[PDB]
Amino acid sequence: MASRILLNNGAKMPILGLGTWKSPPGQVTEAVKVAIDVGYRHIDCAHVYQNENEVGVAIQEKLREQVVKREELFIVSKLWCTYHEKGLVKGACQKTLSDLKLDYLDLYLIHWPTGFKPGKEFFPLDESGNVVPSDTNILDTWAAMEELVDEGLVKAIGISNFNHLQVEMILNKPGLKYKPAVNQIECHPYLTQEKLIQYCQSKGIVVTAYSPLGSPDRPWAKPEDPSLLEDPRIKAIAAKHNKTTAQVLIRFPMQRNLVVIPKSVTPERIAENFKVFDFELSSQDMTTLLSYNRNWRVCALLSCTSHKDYPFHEEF
Numbered sequence: 001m002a003s004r005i006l007l008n009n010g011a012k013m014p015i016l017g018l019g020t021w022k023s024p025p026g027q028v029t030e031a032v033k034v035a036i037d038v039g040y041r042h043i044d045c046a047h048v049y050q051n052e053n054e055v056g057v058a059i060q061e062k063l064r065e066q067v068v069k070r071e072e073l074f075i076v077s078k079l080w081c082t083y084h085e086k087g088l089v090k091g092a093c094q095k096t097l098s099d100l101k102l103d104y105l106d107l108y109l110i111h112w113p114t115g116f117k118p119g120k121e122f123f124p125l126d127e128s129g130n131v132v133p134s135d136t137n138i139l140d141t142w143a144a145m146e147e148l149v150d151e152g153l154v155k156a157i158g159i160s161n162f163n164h165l166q167v168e169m170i171l172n173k174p175g176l177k178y179k180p181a182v183n184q185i186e187c188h189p190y191l192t193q194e195k196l197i198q199y200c201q202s203k204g205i206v207v208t209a210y211s212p213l214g215s216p217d218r219p220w221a222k223p224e225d226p227s228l229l230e231d232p233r234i235k236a237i238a239a240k241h242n243k244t245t246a247q248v249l250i251r252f253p254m255q256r257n258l259v260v261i262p263k264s265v266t267p268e269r270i271a272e273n274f275k276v277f278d279f280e281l282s283s284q285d286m287t288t289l290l291s292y293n294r295n296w297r298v299c300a301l302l303s304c305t306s307h308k309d310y311p312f313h314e315e316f
């Protein structure tokens, strides 16, 4: 299987990338350096992760060392919810560019479909704990994203955590100039996403799977939640293939024509997670993994559930 997938902007995107949410700032520079050394060419970032400066130090060092050329890297970031307004989008993108020490992003995503009140706080709340919306909508935010392409700041634009109706709304936007290249969504054997993936793929939108290992370090994990990495059914498939459970979990989305972005700051795991291009899951393995769906989400957030554009009320 090829290492990159063709996007609807004409560029190629590496199907494996390194995630950076929760990567501590004192560890992520080395993590990204190791990743690039062992073959990663795609890094998934976001302003809200609060570590783009440190990710950028690694990228810049590897460019300066001439380990890789800029054209060989595929750097992704995301516009946070408090920057959906017309007059804030460019500055938000530019702050990310400055922190990452780049002159362009390969892909810039609307992080969530919901706009929040601008200000210092990433999650502005009312006194009862509900997020405070902005009156921005996904269509006007999309137009602002299109401007970034036309200014040379980003090579591609896309969306993240958009449900099927929201994707449809973008595709049906009056005067749409650029289609979204990517929809980045949670996807793993407990949240298999057949409906939304099929829809996006049918429209030429590439899907990126986040939390492919079930995000065991998510800060809201409960001791009782289901655990992909410990599921004996998945362990059995891994054992049959002489691979680790994590390697199976990463290979799974790859064979569905998805991009996948496992996170690690552990050098041995960063390397392990990249060693997924030399084995194949059978069709039976794939269908078996799909059968584990239980509609379980890592990423959901009670404080945001009443926002008009919160994505997870719809079935898909």
Ligand SMILES: NC(=O)c1ccc[n+]([C@@H]2O[C@H](COP(=O)([O-])OP(=O)(O)OC[C@H]3O[C@@H](n4cnc5c(N)ncnc54)[C@H](OP(=O)(O)O)[C@@H]3O)[C@@H](O)[C@H]2O)c1
Pocket (backbone or CB within 6 Å): 018, 019, 020, 021, 022, 044, 045, 111, 160, 161, 184, 185, 209, 210, 211, 212, 213, 214, 215, 216, 217, 218, 229, 244, 246, 247, 261, 262, 263, 264, 265, 266, 269, 270, 272, 273, 298, 299
């Ligand atoms: N667009 C969005 O809204 C959104 C939401 C969630 C995630 N994302 C992106 O997707 C990335 C991945 O998702 P995620 O961070 O939620 O979780 P994940 O990649 O599913 O899991 C990361 C966890 O798995 C551990 N791990 C990594 N490789 C392992 C291996 N080979 N064996 C055992 N454990 C391993 C990591 O530990 P160590 O790091 O300690 O090794 C970390 O605790 C994020 O970092 C972010 O870039 C985007």
Ligand SMILES: O=C(O)COc1cc(Cl)ccc1C(=O)NCc1c(F)cc(Br)cc1F
Pocket (backbone or CB within 6 Å): 021, 046, 048, 049, 050, 112, 113, 114, 299, 300, 301, 304, 310
């Ligand atoms: O959103 C992500 O990329 C990962 O999750 C988070 C990362 C940070 Cl730095 C802070 C918060 C979260 C989180 O709570 N994510 C879930 C979440 C939203 F952040 C925002 C909305 Br809208 C819905 C939702 F489920």
